[PDB]
Design a protein around this ligand. Structure first.
Ligand SMILES: [Mg+2]
Ligand SMILES: [Mg+2]
Ligand SMILES: [Mg+2]
Ligand SMILES: [Mg+2]
Ligand SMILES: [Mg+2]
Ligand SMILES: [Mg+2]
Lengths: 264, 264, 264, 264, 264, 264
């Protein structure tokens, strides 16, 4: 259950071990998540251990508070260096598990991300606080009023943000991440309204982890698009995920959702 | 098995196959340069798998049950010196003796047939008109296509190529939806290394006597689309451009000449 | 003492504190990502120093006599793998229980209060109106401010942060003049990594329940000033813009809302 | 006759050995060829061994087919890392061997490259198939009709392309390379119509190998120049080599050749 | 007194030694000087040894000529690699020593640099030869008439230029450096009239060494600003140092000096 | 002999000469920084060769028979730390006592005399009017100049400099045609490192009391030519601009002043 931090495989026998152990071959319960030039991994056994403990608990708020570190351990960054070579141009398999059904965020919503997008000050963070959410995971944003009085959980890195969201959604709760600010800032690639196009692939990768898990996670993203190129940028963002809600001046201006039987 | 971490450090080891961590391709290894990556296909493992798949009752099930053989069919060699030893590597353009084609068009050169166009141009739904055996889904978000239809989802470029190669050598008709991560991941008004990557993969298909259909959204601007589309067309056997759900342009290199098409 | 050159090379060493050359923060270590750098504050050493400073007759003299303790309070960990282990690291946004503020404004969120504007806008002299305990001078040329007035000059970002943190935890009011070297030294129409660096430092202040005033000349063009100033304001608790010696704009995030100001 | 692939000189005694052996000092029969950031080497003893065997053979087509690997071994990429330092800003000596004469491509043509240049689709590949050539070496281009029925030889990398061209021309035959596409794509430097100026130096380096060898090699180059800047780009290309033919819409539009007694 | 050139600290005990010895911790008489991505160090004991020997000498010109190498050893580049990490965003402390007084270049001039700025051919070098200077240190400029007949001392690198200037000024003489040409060329960072903004921080760092030493050094700087953006660039240069004189067509057009009691 | 691969790893080895793999120039070694490269001339070997050449019946034959001595005269030191130890290295501007000049012009400063202009401006043929001893051909395609005329062809920058230095110290008049590969190979509207490279080589000539004529095609645009030509002229002793075969501008720094010329 311990993650290798420094020591990676140097022999072929060691290279065959799990990512957790410092090898190069995912175990059956490890899914790699490419994000820019990083490769993370979710351990779906740890994930469902935590999610089941939450969902089955007589006091899930208390279990959460007492096991935050275990929850955060669901997603980690493997130590082995050769992953980019061994798995070229890695993505995540687009899947929908058998018997998937959804009423939230909308009826028959495809599993994946539901993005809440808009410019600086558009009201995305406030929009969340008015949806019927279980928990807002606060990451990479300056401390605001949202952090003093709401149902929030503050985290420090992308492992923690994804771990809490995955565990909460797998348990049957409704999580949102506010926000992917540090992905927008951190990811760099060939541009297409000045947007690093690797942002789109990162959102698709995380989206498809959600799809394989049969969950929807709501996520705030300010892509930093100029006024002219915002329509194109939002279209490419919507084409990368299951659903999108656009905020302009505190009001919803557009919403599009891929559904099990269509696209709305 | 493929060597994952131990590479040649002596001249004797360097003479061994790419699979074994050496620098010299064995009789049945073909190197595939893709951007700054170098992959390899083992044509003996390939035709092994193609024979096994040909006697299968479910192509889709065979692939899901044989991920070990697929990763043996196309892999990324561990030896670091390949870029230096094989300067400006491509794949040699060949046509096997006795090659015949009626799909996608009559006398179509073996190679890639690109299905290209902008976001939401209808490329994914266009594949439904092409009498394909199945669509290999890669790098795209989970969509209606992935739950209703003959698809096989993969995670990386080795897997996408291996499945398509095995399918085509067995006599089936594959498409890859899509090469999105080549567009985003290759960086060098599009990076010229996208064009050489398509020529390299195209010529592997030419050596194998196969045609693989491939979706590409190049993320070009309206001003530069016409240029980027010619550059793409000059890299491959054939190309079909979609706009707003309809074919607007087509060009195919054939065994004795060239065809063109113009629509709306 | 802080490890300067020997870092963890075994899994057992990796579990040790950042101070000791490991990769896992001890109970009282908080990582501070700044561009491609990762610093750490030790909150136990911090409150040690804050108690010692609180019983001092000269804050300025105490700092000059305790450079060893200051370099123990904020330091740059030696272990190289931190960027990989903690992906897209930020600082978690928190507000300590019982936090109260009347300075710089009523109910001001803990965080940074930026004093911003172009060259010669009057930022350094503006600090004289803010009832500060002293101005921490960093990255600026020797000026009249440095010979006449309550200043303490430092050389690097660890020192600037440590002095400000110790001062504020002890109940004094610090300003840093200036973050010039963050503007110049962070590079990635301003580098987006300046914004994430300010959010990270801001949220360390939020966790500590303090406000630190900080001068920033972002070197933006007249055309882009309005945009860069919103991006800066969206990264921190509060911001005051100077033009030609006068406040032209202000915005502050408070415990229950937001304030704005407009001048000439 | 074996080329060092992994093991390079680590002592001064080893550094004095030939490039073939992993040393840093060319033997009398090794000529280094700088191409972008690469350094190749032609072994002129292997070259003239192959060329003489071809030229003296009762069945040169059969000798070629039976010795393709030996032919390809004429040019290799040395393993030693310090070559760029030891030979700063390396080029190739401009020489014309005593008693040089030429009737092909034109009368009294300077030894060197004869470039066939023009934009995408301009008819360069077809132009070759109408010159009185012995062999077209196909490299880096997608498989086309040219590869099914003509006198062609398909290769994979720049070593092979140069080896076959040098050997064929030294034997008294007339070779062309279609094309230097992967040099245009692969080489990057300070631009001057957007053309990486290291393209010009690569063509001069290869040109001067041809001049030292007393041969002319015809080479297709599509420099990817915009319409506006094509006149300047073609002029700089002509200034880098012995001769140039420009194709526009399948017709020759300009031709310029440096001659032993003038410039036409 | 010997400087470590190759061997740096590899243990914590060694890391605690002086920069001269290959450690990471400045001795009490070492001041680090960040310049772009370099870190130099001035040894103030060697500095004042040389300066006192000069100032006390019955024949200071002869002592200078006989001890040039010792003078040049006052500033060196430490060998230890971790300095950028250990001292994040390093600058130099802005200080003015107690009892500082100045009549040169102007009355009550702040200690620091006095920049002589202007475009190519503006007359900066000639301007120096008309000020009442003791010595012009010539660095990085092509040999000109200034080097044949004047009171000059030619040096090769930034250590030597700073060493001679510091020693001369500490001895009570009046030095100028003509010029910082290689800093302008060598330093690269995010731009703000195309000027690498790390140029401003380098000038502030060197300025503050002068301020800590209670000296003024005159320095020629041609920032290579375009005509349009020169006013802004000169303003940012003046904001980085104690004083500035601008030359246009061989005449002084602007002069600004920070004084102990004001700014002129 | 020059060390090619073994460099200093102890402080004792570091004190040895550059030739021997150390970091400290011997009495007669002068470092020559060129872009990111650092070369060295050994002035004792130089004057050895100049005496031998002076008693030669064919300068051209002497050079071809003494490639070993030429590579001992200018070489690239193996030690890696030189950039750090000698920050922003240049060459000190000097004029030897007793220097006199009548070529290329009266009282011409020792240094480079650049012959500059665009493609086909007539720079190579202009050298025929300058009463040269021979033209050192480097980096240019084989031309009529190379078969008819007094030329000596070389391959790299060490060779070009060494031949020119030896020729000039022996009393002959060398020109280098051309520095093309400095223009293409130095990259940092021209890279400013071209200008500092010319100043460094210029000042080596100044220390040696020689003038070397050098052709440069800087590849500037018509809009930027005037600026790039001043920047080049401000880097060297003298410069002549060619347009369409005729001198259009000239400037020369002399022992006591400056000359200028204007043509068509
Ligand atoms: Mg928000
Ligand atoms: Mg699609
Ligand atoms: Mg200020
Ligand atoms: Mg062609
Ligand atoms: Mg000057
Ligand atoms: Mg010429």
């Amino acid at each position: 259950e311990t993650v290798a931090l420094v020591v990676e495989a140097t022999t072929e026998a060691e290279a065959k071990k799990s990512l957790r152990e410092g090898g190069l071959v995912p175990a059956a319960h490890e899914i790699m998540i490419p994000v820019g030039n990083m490769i993370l991994a979710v351990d779906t056994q740890v994930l469902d251990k935590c999610a089941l403990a939450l969902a089955a608990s007589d006091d899930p708020g208390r279990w959460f508070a007492e096991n935050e570190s275990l929850i955060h351990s669901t997603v980690f960054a493997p130590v082995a260096k050769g992953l980019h070579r061994v798995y070229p141009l890695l993505s995540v398999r687009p899947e929908v598990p058998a018997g998937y059904e959804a009423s939230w965020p909308t009826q028959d919503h495809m599993p994946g991300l539901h993005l809440v997008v808009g410019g600086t000050g558009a009201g995305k963070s406030s929009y969340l606080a008015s949806q019927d959410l279980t928990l807002v995971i606060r990451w990479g944003e300056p401390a605001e009023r949202f952090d003093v009085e709401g149902a929030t959980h503050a985290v420090s890195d992308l492992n923690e943000a994804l771990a809490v969201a995955f565990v909460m959604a797998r348990a049957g709760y409704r999580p949102a991440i506010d926000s992917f600010r540090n992905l927008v800032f951190g990811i760099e690639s060939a541009a297409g309204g000045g947007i690093s196009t690797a942002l789109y692939s990162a959102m698709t990768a995380i989206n498809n982890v959600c799809s394989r898990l049969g969950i929807v996670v709501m996520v705030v993203v300010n892509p930093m698009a100029t006024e002219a190129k915002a329509e194109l940028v939002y279209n490419n963002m919507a084409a990368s995920v299951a659903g999108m809600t656009v905020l302009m001046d505190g009001a919803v201006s557009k919403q599009t959702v891929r559904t099990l039987s269509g696209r709305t």
